[PDB]
């Protein structure tokens, strides 16, 4: 669908509640952010969590990570999710770009 990134979960209350542990795929799509993981090994994948954009309070990044705060209507529950990554900015431009297009509707 949209851009994909290999990120690692950095502990927060929200990620503990949802059981996030190591590395995951974070992909930015037309209306949401999705967290995917890889099944055993064929390095096979499927969807874990959905963060619809109309349910994201805010998001930020730096050379170390990308973060966001989910609203309480999210399957994840409200709170912050931080993912260590050296492409936080690309993730931020992809998310910002996708929301401005969703909003232009």
């Amino acid at each position: 669908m949209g851009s994909q990134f290999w990120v690692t979960s950095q502990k927060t209350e929200a990620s503990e509640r949802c059981g996030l542990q190591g590395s995951y795929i974070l992909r930015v799509e037309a209306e949401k952010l999705t967290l995917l993981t890889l099944g055993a090994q064929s390095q096979i994948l499927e969807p874990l969590l959905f963060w619809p954009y109309t349910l994201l309070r805010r998001y930020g990044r730096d050379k170390v990570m990308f973060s966001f705060e989910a609203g309480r209507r999210c399957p994840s529950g409200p709170g912050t999710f931080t993912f260590q990554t050296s492409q936080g900015n690309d993730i931020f431009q992809a998310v910002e770009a996708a929301i401005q297009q969703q909003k232009a509707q």
């Binding site: 349910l55 309070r57 805010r58 998001y59 930020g60 990044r61 730096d62 973060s67 609203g71 909003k103």
Partner: peptide, 10 residues
């Protein structure tokens, strides 16, 4: 680092 998401709640 951060920005508020205007699209929030629409």
């Amino acid at each position: 680092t951060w920005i508020e998401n205007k699209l929030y709640g629409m």
